[PDB]
Amino acid sequence: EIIWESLSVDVGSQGNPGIVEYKGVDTKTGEVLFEREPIPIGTNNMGEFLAIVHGLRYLKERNSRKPIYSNSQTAIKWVKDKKAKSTLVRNEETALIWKLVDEAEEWLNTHTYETPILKWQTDKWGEIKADY
RNA sequence: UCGACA
């Protein structure tokens, strides 16, 4: 039940919170579609969030109806609810990560999309293809 | 309390 005609996104971080990054790829070819420039500091869940919303953008501007695979239970939800509920403090250091996270919001609720966002069954299918 | 996904 793996829909290979999809986009699988995942985040790679160093410490949580800390240096964060994500990337989307073709669930099958493993081809790297979009990659995020390593952010200074940010939580994992925010990483996931952005990873998804970015992929959401990527598709819409290519007119793709491919669903999205994320193993972030927290983000898949945040996104469904168009609301990132991150408890990370807002200070000049968590600037960029919060800047982005907000724009991802300003987008979610100012756009349309039927793009399915699906949970990747890591326990049954192994690490997601966009994994580091 | 724990459980779950990262």
Next chain:
DNA sequence: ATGTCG
């Protein structure tokens, strides 16, 4: 250990 959710 921390980030989040149920």
